[PDB]
Amino acid sequence: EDAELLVTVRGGRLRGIRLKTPGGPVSAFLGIPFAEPPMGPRRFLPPEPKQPWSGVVDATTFQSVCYQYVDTLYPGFEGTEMWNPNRELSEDCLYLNVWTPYPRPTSPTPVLVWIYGGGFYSGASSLDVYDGRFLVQAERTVLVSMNYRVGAFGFLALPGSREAPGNVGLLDQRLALQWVQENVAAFGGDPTSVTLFGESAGAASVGMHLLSPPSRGLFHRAVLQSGAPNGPWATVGMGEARRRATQLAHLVGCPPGGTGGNDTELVACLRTRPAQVLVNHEWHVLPQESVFRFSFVPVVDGDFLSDTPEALINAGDFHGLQVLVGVVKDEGSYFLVYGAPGFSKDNESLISRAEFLAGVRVGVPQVSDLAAEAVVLHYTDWLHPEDPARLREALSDVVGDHNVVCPVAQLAGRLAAQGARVYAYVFEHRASTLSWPLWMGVPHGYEIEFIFGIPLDPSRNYTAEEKIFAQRLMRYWANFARTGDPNEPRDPKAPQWPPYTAGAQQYVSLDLRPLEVRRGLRAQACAFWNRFLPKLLSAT
Amino acid sequence: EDAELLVTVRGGRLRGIRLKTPGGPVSAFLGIPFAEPPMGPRRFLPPEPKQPWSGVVDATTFQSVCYQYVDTLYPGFEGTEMWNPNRELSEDCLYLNVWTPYPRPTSPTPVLVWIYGGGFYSGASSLDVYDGRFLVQAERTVLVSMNYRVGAFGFLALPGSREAPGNVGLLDQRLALQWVQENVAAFGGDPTSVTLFGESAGAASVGMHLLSPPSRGLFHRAVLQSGAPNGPWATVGMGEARRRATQLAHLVGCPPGGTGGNDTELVACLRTRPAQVLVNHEWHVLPQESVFRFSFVPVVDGDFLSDTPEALINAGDFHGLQVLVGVVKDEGSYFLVYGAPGFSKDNESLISRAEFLAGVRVGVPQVSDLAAEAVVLHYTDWLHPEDPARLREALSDVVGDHNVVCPVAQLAGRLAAQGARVYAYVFEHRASTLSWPLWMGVPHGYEIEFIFGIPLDPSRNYTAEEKIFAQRLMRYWANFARTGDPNEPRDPKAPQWPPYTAGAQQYVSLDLRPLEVRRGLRAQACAFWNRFLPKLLSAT
Ligand SMILES: C=CC[N+](C)(C)c1ccc(CCC(=O)CCc2ccc([N+](C)(C)CC=C)cc2)cc1
Ligand SMILES: C=CC[N+](C)(C)c1ccc(CCC(=O)CCc2ccc([N+](C)(C)CC=C)cc2)cc1
Q1: Which fold has domain B1-540?
Q2: With helix as H, strand as E and coil as C, how does B407-466 read?
Q3: Are strands B56-58 and B221-225 parallel, antiparallel or unpaired?
Q4: How far is A152 from A275, CA to CA, in rounded Å?
Q5: Secondary structure of B347-406 in HEC code, one letter for each residue
Q6: What contacts B473, CB < 8 A, 6 or more positions away?
Q7: Among B291, B503, B418, CA closest to A387
Q8: What one-character DSSP code corresponds to residue A159?
Q9: Of the candidates B519, B531, B539, which has its C-beta nearest A370's C-beta?
């Protein structure tokens, strides 16, 4: 037997597993507890560290997926099923994974910590696309991933109460970061160069940790992929959070028979309801029909987030911080088949002029009629105001800019001008195995497979140029984790990647072609969302 | 005893003069009185037809210019002085001029009636650039131009009173049009094919004759160069017209401090003041400092204009009408040196960001701060937000589109979509003799010298290809006056000039190169001024 798979951490001992990759073996430790299971009376409560265990915990397989909604829009379709849970759902789900090279590094190694996304209602570290055996084997780095509570189990907030304080799903991530500081050295990891990187709701969560003092001291670099904490979907006010939690309780029968309005009795009822009863009513508490809007998201409670994320970025000092931000080519196209009128993944979605006018009401919810008119003008080609193919591509840009691209460009612009060294990219490659239709372009979440070196898997049908492109993207992400710069540093033939400056606004395009530097992260479109639109609704 | 230079009309007898052109001789009749001199008691009143005269009226030289402000911004400068009066000022100015070919055409010939511009405060038919000896000799047409009262003498309005009804300057043009009907046949003209073309405020007057039923029966085709009746500067309501008229009186000493407020005794005072006293206080009645805004302009009284010009365009039927509209490449550049901050004729006019923000409030007067912010959002290059050269061209486009280009696009779109045949052009050539600086480009009013064949003058130093370019535009303009279609009737080799329609939006570019068809008359920019900005002002 091998002795590399037996590790002693502060809790106890673990037995790992040796996984095969085309280029070598990797040591994996899957299912490591970092918190007591938040079930029964611990539901909705902040996590507490795992009690030390006697004996050896079997860390040779993925643990359970946190309880969450399961996508049933297109059953049996690879594009949607690839993000659904691949393990049993359970409230017992606070387990983390560690990947380390073989043989174990003798010298301390940088640590990458992956925080998956999923609109704060879904996601798991067990997904095959999030497998980090190829990233660890190729770049010889320590990769850590964890499960955090999602949906109502992680973000239901009755603000001002001890039983449902909210943001407990983000506190799961912080506790998993504290576990890295205390235990990553046992796997050959360097706790003095931790690099947080997430995507979608995970990229927003990484931004939430930058704005929180207790979480700031647990990492040193950040990568945000298609997400930011200042997005319109990432947070919610305490008033709305109280209303959404109250309606969800009323939907499940709480409080019983017009009982007293204490928050103590309300949460007491929600702890007795089966886990699936809460999940079956997650989407019924949304205020209106919309896309890219979620029921239970992080709340500005004053504890974790002192102020709104928009305010904390404006007054924050970010010296000694390296940030890598980016977006895919067509961010908003993925969310249109989830409720926007006239859109289907099985045809071409050649929407009419009237459907485009209604898609803005769903894509940009809770805005005045005049505010919707400004959005219509800015995205309507008035030479062809009724071209179906142009209206379809235009509505994709409306959802993409409003939710992902423009909140990211403002974050990168404010980070660079306040001490941080920011690098920006734009993912422009469409994988040859993409099951989604052609008009979707480069949809949300489909750069993750290339970052995690999935094309290196022999069973997958990626092409030869995509495999080389996968190693190059891993090099960029790993180089940023070690030295804080995506460059080699010396190649010296590869075009350099210039940092994103608030004035020049430089970024690169990532595809099969070499690095091409561009200027402006959709400056003309985002100037409307970040500058003019706030004044439009502020002046009633 | 030359029979060609003696003509008997309804009023009496006229002796003309034979003028020289490099091609051939032309018979000109300059100074025909078509109305009684509006002096003394006839000041501010509609014109009366000229009494028949016993004898022979001398029509061998241009008559006096209507009293008007004289530009003293850049004295002794060819650019501004070429638009200043070349004859002595007098209220006795209602005279017209007729150019006819030599020998006189034995068959009826189409007539081209020319209306000068000048912001309704200046202008004259005696100007050298308005000489129609080359257009008549080369294309064998009949050119007629008149003098209409400008400034307060032609547009001061006290609505509700019979002493100062307003729009009297417009009636001077209609009376000259009735003179054409009764007398143009004596010069060889065809009152059945009368084409009415103007420029700037003259093009605005042409469009206002289209919306006046009595003036509708005096012409059959219309051309509007860099002007529209629906522009924000072309009309003023009755309420503001009474304010500007009464405020102008208070400056000249009327009413006699202090008589009653009835208009009868107020106009009685304004008729006693010398004409120059009325001109010296013309600009002192403007409510706000602004460019491309003029004191006394046509008023919506109900007699001449039943409703606002925009409302009349939306409801009128224009079947059987052929219209030629167009703008120059750089409309707003001429007006920037007339008050906009940081702009000078003698330097590069590299304005700062603060000067740009201040110039928008001058170019777009009397709009909300939120409305001004919307204007800054459109015309700012947010990738280079402080570039002085780009900010200069930006402010030149704001004034150009808001006042000229977009009001023309609204007319041409609603004319074609309601039965009228519309052709559109964009003049892009900058004359080699242009005394204005280079950053102005192709300024306002500098296509007129090419339409009138002035480059064919041997005393002027126009280039060889510019002379040929002048003969092209005269052919385009003459063919439209004869056939109703600009492109040559029998020439399949010359590129075709397609009609402008609401959906296609097709125009041509006029320069040294052959016709090049384009799509969209500033469609993206004009969508903001025509569609969105009205809604932004409705909710204040
Ligand atoms: C049809 C009815 C269903 N009903 C209930 C109405 C329904 C259900 C869900 C939604 C919102 C769906 C999203 O907003 C996608 C959110 C999302 C974000 C990221 C990810 N990755 C994990 C990153 C993978 C991205 C591909 C996945 C999903 C609308 C309606
Ligand atoms: C320094 C003070 C001057 N003050 C009194 C303040 C002053 C005076 C005049 C103006 C308005 C000037 C214009 O809006 C140009 C109007 C115009 C338009 C067209 C033409 N063409 C005849 C077509 C020729 C164009 C080239 C001529 C003039 C503002 C301020």
Answers
A1: Rossmann fold (3.40.50)
A2: HHHHHHHHHHCCCCEEEEEEECCCCCCCCCCHHHCCCCCCCHHHHCCHHHCCCCCCCHHH
A3: unpaired
A4: 10
A5: CCCCCCHHHHHHHHHHHCCCCCHHHHHHHHHHHCCCCCCCCHHHHHHHHHHHHHHHHHHH
A6: B447, B450, B451, B510
A7: B503
A8: T
A9: B539
Residue A47 DSSP class:
P
DSSP string, A118-133: STTT---TT-GGG--H
Closest CA to B43 of B152, B117, B122: B152
Long-range contacts of B487-495 (CB under 8 A, 24+ apart): B487/B515
Cβ distance of A535 and B382 shorter than 8 Å = no
Are B349 and B439 in contact by the 8 Å Cβ rule? The answer is yes
B56-58 and B17-20: which strand pairing? unpaired
User: Tokens 């090099």 map to which residue?
Assistant: A475
Sequence spans of domains, chain B: 1-540
What does DSSP say about strands A221-225 and B322-328: parallel, antiparallel, or unpaired? unpaired
Cβ neighbours for A359, distance < 8 A, ≥ 6 positions apart: A336, A340, A341, A342, A343, A351, A395, A398
H helix or E strand, kind and range, residue A512:
none
**What tokens were used for A534?**
């706030």
Residue B56 is given by DSSP the state E
Burial code of B290-326, b = ≥16 C-beta within 10 A, e = fewer? bbbbbbbbbbbbeebbeeebbebbeebebeebbbbbb
Q: How is residue A470 written in tokens?
A: 């996968």
- What is the rounded distance in angstroms from the CA atom of residue B410 to the CA atom of residue B405? 9
Residues 6 or more apart whose Cβ sits within 8 Å of residue B19 = B25, B26, B27, B28, B99, B133
- Chain centroid, CA B319 distance in Å: 24
**How far is it, in rounded angstroms, from Cα A513 to Cα A517?**
12
Q: Classify the phi-psi angles of A40: left when phi > 0, otherwise alpha if psi is within -120 to 50, otherwise beta.
A: left
Tell me whether residue A368 is annotated as binding: no
- For residues B247 and A39, give the distance between their C-alpha atoms in angstroms, rounded to a whole number: 82
Residues paired with B25 in a beta bridge: B20
Q: How close A330 comes to chain B (CA, Å)?
A: 21
Q: Phi first, then psi: give them for residue B193, nearest 5 degrees.
A: -125, 80
Please identify which of the residues A122, A200, A215, A349 carries the catalytic annotation: A200
* Separation of alpha carbons A402 and A63, rounded Å: 36
Q: How many CB atoms lie within 10 A of CB A524?
A: 14
- Cα–ligand 2 centroid distance for B335 (angstroms): 7
Residues 6+ apart with CB under 8 A from A90: A64, A65, A66, A67
**Residues pairing with B197 in the sheet:** B114, B223
Distance CA A135, CA A452 (A): 6
B329 close to B442: Cβ distance less than 8 angstroms: yes
Q: CB pairs under 8 A, 24+ apart, for B78-82?
A: B78/B435, B79/B345, B79/B434, B79/B435, B79/B436, B82/B127, B82/B128, B82/B129
How far is A479 from B66, CA to CA, in rounded Å? 79
Q: Determine phi and psi for A28, rounding to 5 degrees.
A: -120, 145
Query: Which residue of B357, B367, B369, B377 to mutate against A (max A Cβ within 10 Å)?
Result: B377
Test B532 with A377 for CB contact under 8 angstroms. yes
Distance from the Cα of residue A303 to its chain's centroid:
22
Check residue B272 and report its DSSP letter.
T
Beta carbons of B110 and B61 less than 8 angstroms apart? no
For residue A531, the 8-state DSSP code is I
